[PDB]
Amino acid sequence: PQDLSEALKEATKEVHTQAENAEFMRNFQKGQVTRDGFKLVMASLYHIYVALEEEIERNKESPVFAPVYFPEELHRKAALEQDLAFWYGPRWQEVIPYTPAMQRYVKRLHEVGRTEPELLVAHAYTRYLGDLSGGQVLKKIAQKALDLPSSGEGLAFFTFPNIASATKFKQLYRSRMNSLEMTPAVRQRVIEEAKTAFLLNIQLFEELQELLTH
Numbered sequence: 001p002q003d004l005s006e007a008l009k010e011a012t013k014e015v016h017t018q019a020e021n022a023e024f025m026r027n028f029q030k031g032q033v034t035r036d037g038f039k040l041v042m043a044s045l046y047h048i049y050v051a052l053e054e055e056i057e058r059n060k061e062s063p064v065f066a067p068v069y070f071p072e073e074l075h076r077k078a079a080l081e082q083d084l085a086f087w088y089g090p091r092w093q094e095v096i097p098y099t100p101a102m103q104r105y106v107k108r109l110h111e112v113g114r115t116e117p118e119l120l121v122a123h124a125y126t127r128y129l130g131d132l133s134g135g136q137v138l139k140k141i142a143q144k145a146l147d148l149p150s151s152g153e154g155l156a157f158f159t160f161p162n163i164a165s166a167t168k169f170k171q172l173y174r175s176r177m178n179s180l181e182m183t184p185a186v187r188q189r190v191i192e193e194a195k196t197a198f199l200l201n202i203q204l205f206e207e208l209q210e211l212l213t214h
């Protein structure tokens with residue numbers, strides 16, 4: 001359509017369906033991804049979010065990003081730090097894995113942030129809106145289909161606490177995506193970054209399945 005949000009949802013529809021069928025996300029819902037596998041996901045999110053969120057911070061203030069900047073509602077870095085300390089312990093920072101597929105993903109994020117910040121909005125949409133779309137049904141699959149000790153920790157990533165309703169927030173985020181000012185050339189690229197974004201996730205899933213199978 002002519003609304004960026006709707007353009008994004010339509011384009012990335014097939015790649016998105018590829019992830020629905022990925023071997024890793026099927027076991028990750030069939031409720032049987034090992035505690036090892038879960039921790040690799042969390043570790044993956046951390047590195048990604050750290051990247052996404054440095055570059056968002058670098059580009060906040062810029063017309064290409066300002067309008068979709070909601071730091072309090074969306075930031076995930078602290079939430080993942082809390083979680084990783086529970087999953088990996090007090091020295092999580094030194095022990096967490098950092099694989100080729102995570103770095104791939106993280107590489108693109110710094111590139112876009114540093115040279116094509118006008119595309120950063122493609123990664124925000126894919127990350128935030130999708131994560132917000134699943135942090136609910138997923139968190140259950142997780143916890144119940146996971147452990148945990150009588151913890152009270154380890155699943156904070158799945159709650160955006162400064163967002164009372166995900167629905168009301170998405171709508172406002174899309175709204176704000178739609179008044180993003182953009183050349184038709186840039187817009188086509190942002191669209192194509194949304195696909196690249198999904199692809200980076202897919203390659204990440206395929207890598208984590210490799211590591212978790214032998």
Ligand code: HEM
Pocket residue numbers: 005008009016019020021022025026125126127129130131133197198201202
């Ligand atoms: C088997 C794997 C997946 C399943 C089963 C799944 C499921 C869903 C479903 C049912 C929705 C509808 C939104 C809603 O519930 O209200 C959704 C939305 C969404 N998904 Fe996924 N998803 C998967 C993988 C992914 C991945 C890997 C990404 C990218 C990292 C992604 C990105 C998004 C985004 C950005 C939205 C909403 C954005 C918008 O409204 O335009 N999905 N997902």
